[PDB]
Amino acid sequence: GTILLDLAPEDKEYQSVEEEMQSTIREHRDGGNAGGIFNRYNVIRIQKVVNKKLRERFCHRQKEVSEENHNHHNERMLFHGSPFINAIIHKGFDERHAYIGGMFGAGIYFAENSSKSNQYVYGIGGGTGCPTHKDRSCYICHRQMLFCRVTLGKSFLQFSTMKMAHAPPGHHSVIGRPSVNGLAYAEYVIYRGEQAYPEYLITYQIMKPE
Ligand SMILES: N#Cc1ccc(O[C@H]2CC[C@H](NC(=O)CCSc3nc4ccccc4c(=O)[nH]3)CC2)cc1
Ligand SMILES: [Zn+2]
Structure with a gap:
């Protein structure tokens, strides 16, 4: 099956992943309703996800995508x-x-x-918050997100992605790009599970502002 490998905080890979997470905290126009109110995360664990079967499906798909994108698979490290x-x-x-x-x-x-x-850790728009306290801004319960390897191949750009079932012909991914009456930030979408590998499992808590 899968093997989770704990990274030590002194390891530069650990530091690398936490920095990308801590440094990509942005302002969201919802007053923190969805994800909570915080300026920082308390990263309490970062595990490397090792699964040979999964990495091989991922790599095989990355190869087909390459064939179709002039030999560029176009991998990108993104959060989910x-x-x-x-x-x-x-x-x-x-x-x-x-x-x-x-x-x-x-x-x-x-x-x-x-x-x-x-914002999606507990569901769309944060759902009803953590299971125990039904608090979307809970500072007690441990949250988890993945920093993944995503094969985008040839991406199709558009403003809305709500009614897509597959990437457009000739493409392998779709990126919803920002617009005044639309998205605030770009969102990357794949329609084949094998186009993403869950590299890192991050366990954390949002921290209250001081
Ligand atoms: N039982 C079971 C089971 C259920 C689901 C499953 O895989 C699902 C496959 C589809 C996923 N669903 C999504 O990707 C869409 C909603 S969650 C989400 N939406 C975003 C929107 C914009 C920017 C970032 C994010 C983000 O980080 N997360 C959730 C996981 C695998 C097994
Ligand atoms: Zn809680």
Whole structure:
């Protein structure tokens, strides 16, 4: 199955991952309703996800995408947050659990900003918050998000991605780009679970502002 390898805080890989997370905290126009109010994270664990079967499916797909994108697979390290982390790290991402509805197409979404992904940790718009206190801004309960390897290949740019079922012909991913009456930040979407590898499992808590 999967093997989770703990990284030590003195390891530069650990430091690297935490910096990208802490440094990509942004202002969200919702007053912190979805992800909570914080200026910082308390990263309490970072585990490397080792799964040979998964890495091989990922690499094989990366090869097909390459063939179709003039030999560039176009890999990008992005964040993902959702209530299904434990399923993802063991079974990998699966498009079959992605459905067209609301503001989402039938794909798997990613963000370059950790605070964006944080908003989805407990569900769309934060859902009802943590399981124990039903608090979207809970500072007690431990949250988890993934910093993943995402194969974007040839991306199709657009303003909305809510009614997509697959990437457009000739493409392998879709990026919802910013717009005045639309998105505030870009969102990266894949429609095949094997186009993303859950490299890092980050366990953390948002911290209250001091
Ligand atoms: N049971 C079960 C089971 C259930 C689901 C599963 O894989 C799912 C496959 C589809 C995913 N669903 C999504 O990707 C969309 C909603 S979660 C989300 N939305 C964003 C929007 C913009 C920017 C960043 C993010 C982000 O970080 N997370 C969730 C996980 C695998 C196993
Ligand atoms: Zn809680």
